[PDB]
A paper describes a structure:
Recent studies have shown that the nuclear pore protein NUP358 contains a C-terminal cyclophilin domain (NUP358Cyp) that interacts with the capsid of HIV-1. The lentiviral capsid protein differs from its gammaretrovirus counterpart in that it has an extra loop between helices 4 and 5 of its N-terminal domain (CAN), called the CypA-binding loop. The cyclophilin A-binding loop is so-called because it is the site of interaction with the cellular isomerase, cyclophilin A (CypA). NUP358 is a large, multidomain protein that forms the cytoplasmic filaments of the vertebrate nuclear pore complex.
The cyclophilin domain from human NUP358 (NUP358Cyp) shares only 65% amino acid sequence identity with CypA. To determine how NUP358Cyp binds HIV-1 we solved the X-ray crystal structure of HIV-1 CAN in complex with NUP358Cyp at 1.95 Å resolution (see Additional file 1 for data collection and refinement statistics). As observed for the recently published structure of uncomplexed NUP358Cyp, despite the sequence variation between CypA and NUP358Cyp, the structures of the two cyclophilins are remarkably similar (Cα atoms show an r.m.s.d of 0.5 Å). The slot-like binding site found in CypA is preserved in NUP358Cyp and the complex of HIV-1 CAN with NUP358Cyp has a similar quaternary arrangement to the CypA complex. The CypA-binding loop of HIV-1 CAN projects down into NUP358Cyp and mediates almost all direct interactions. In comparison to CypA, NUP358Cyp has residues with bulkier side-chains at the capsid interface, such as K117 and D59 (A117 and G59 in CypA), resulting in a more extended active site surface. This is reflected in a larger buried surface area in the NUP358Cyp:HIV-1 CAN complex (610 Å) compared to CypA:HIV-1 CAN (420 Å). For instance, the carbonyl of I91 in CAN makes an important hydrogen bond interaction with CypA via the pyrrole ring of W121 and with NUP358Cyp via the imidazole side chain of H121. An important hydrogen bond interaction in both NUP358Cyp and CypA occurs between the side-chain of CAN H87 and the peptide oxygen of residue 71 in the cyclophilins. Analysis of the HIV-1 CAN:NUP358Cyp structure reveals that residue 61 is located at the center of the binding site, almost directly under CAN P90. The conservation of R55 positioning and its proximity to CAN P90 suggested to us that R55 may hydrogen bond with the peptide oxygen of P90 and lower the activation energy for cis-trans prolyl isomerization.
Numbering used by the authors:
A (entry chain D): 1 to 4, 9 to 145
B (entry chain A): -4 to 164
The structure:
């Protein structure tokens, strides 16, 4: 995650362990969402992916989550069309839906958007998409 | 500039800001270095293919960096169209962004050149190996500086800057 000068740190194993704990023990409970929010303060898209990917099993649930993420990524692209460069000094290219989801963007790009003045909080945007997906999964049970 | 040649095509833009004339920009295109990219730009100036820069605008201007235009389809940076298609490949990166008054292709990454272009306002080495430089402003940099004054750091323009006339000399 990004911690405040804003500096990057890799995700903590303790954060991953706490997420795996709540997913395993209290599966499909509403309280998975607040625990996800509690454990993802300043998280990059990379961090969020690492959290989600650490869980073994629940692959049908992950597939649903992935489908929700793809819908929100496509919705981002629908509302944010790409503009041609060149990129000015000290500026970032526009993030696409797949960049926010941590698929096509580098860690350095993710850090760049999150710590820019003004920032594009790609970590927070992706978090909203994930929480939407988690809500769907909980809703059907 | 030692890349200049008498046989290179010379083209021009007459530019206006909300109807107020700003003057003529005269550009030489490096056909001797990048003939394919130069030919696209030349044809778009004359409009001989049935489309071109006539009545296009400078939709994005970042002072001390670039004056950008050539979005002949969407007029906002999301569009563009070349004589070879809506995309064509990067020809070469021989000519570098060494100073102001250079013509360089705008793009959205590798091999996505169309009609969008930039006139440089400063040396921009960070564009080297990414944008194809294909010409320079031979005369009328004063007009380019007038365009610059209507820009902002984020690229927004405070006047409608239209290429009211263009062609080949």
């Amino acid at each position: 995650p990004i911690v405040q000068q804003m500096v990057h740190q890799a995700i903590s194993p303790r954060t991953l362990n706490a997420w795996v704990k709540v997913v395993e023990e209290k599966a499909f409970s509403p309280e998975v969402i607040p625990m996800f929010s509690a454990l993802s303060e300043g998280a990059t898209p990379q961090d969020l992916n690492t959290m989600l990917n650490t869980v073994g099993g629940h692959q049908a649930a992950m597939q649903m989550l992935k489908e929700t993420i793809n819908e929100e990524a496509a919705e981002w692209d629908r509302l944010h069309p790409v503009h041609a460069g060149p990129i000015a000094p000290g500026q970032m290219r526009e993030p696409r839906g797949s960049d926010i989801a941590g698929t096509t963007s580098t860690l350095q790009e993710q850090i760049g958007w999150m710590t820019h003045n003004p920032p594009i909080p790609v970590g927070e945007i992706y978090k909203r998409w994930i929480i939407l997906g988690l809500n769907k999964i909980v809703r059907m049970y | 500039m030692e890349l200049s040649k008498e046989t290179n095509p010379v083209v021009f833009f007459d530019v206006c800001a909300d109807g107020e004339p700003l003057g003529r920009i005269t550009m030489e295109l490096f056909s001797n270095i990048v003939p394919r990219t130069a030919e696209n730009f030349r044809a778009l100036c004359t409009g001989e293919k049935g489309f071109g820069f006539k009545n296009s605008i400078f939709h994005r201007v970042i002072p001390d960096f670039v004056c950008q235009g050539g979005d002949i389809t969407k007029h906002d940076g999301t569009g563009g169209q070349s004589i070879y298609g809506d995309k064509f490949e990067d020809e070469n990166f021989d000519v570098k962004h060494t100073g102001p008054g250079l013509l360089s292709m705008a793009n959205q990454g590798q091999n996505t050149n169309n009609s969008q272009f930039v006139i440089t306002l400063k040396k921009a080495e960070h564009l080297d190996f990414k944008h194809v430089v294909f010409g320079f402003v031979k005369d009328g940099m004063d007009t380019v500086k007038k365009i610059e004054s209507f820009g902002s750091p984020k690229g927004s323009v405070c006047r409608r800057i239209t290429i009211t006339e263009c062609g080949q000399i």
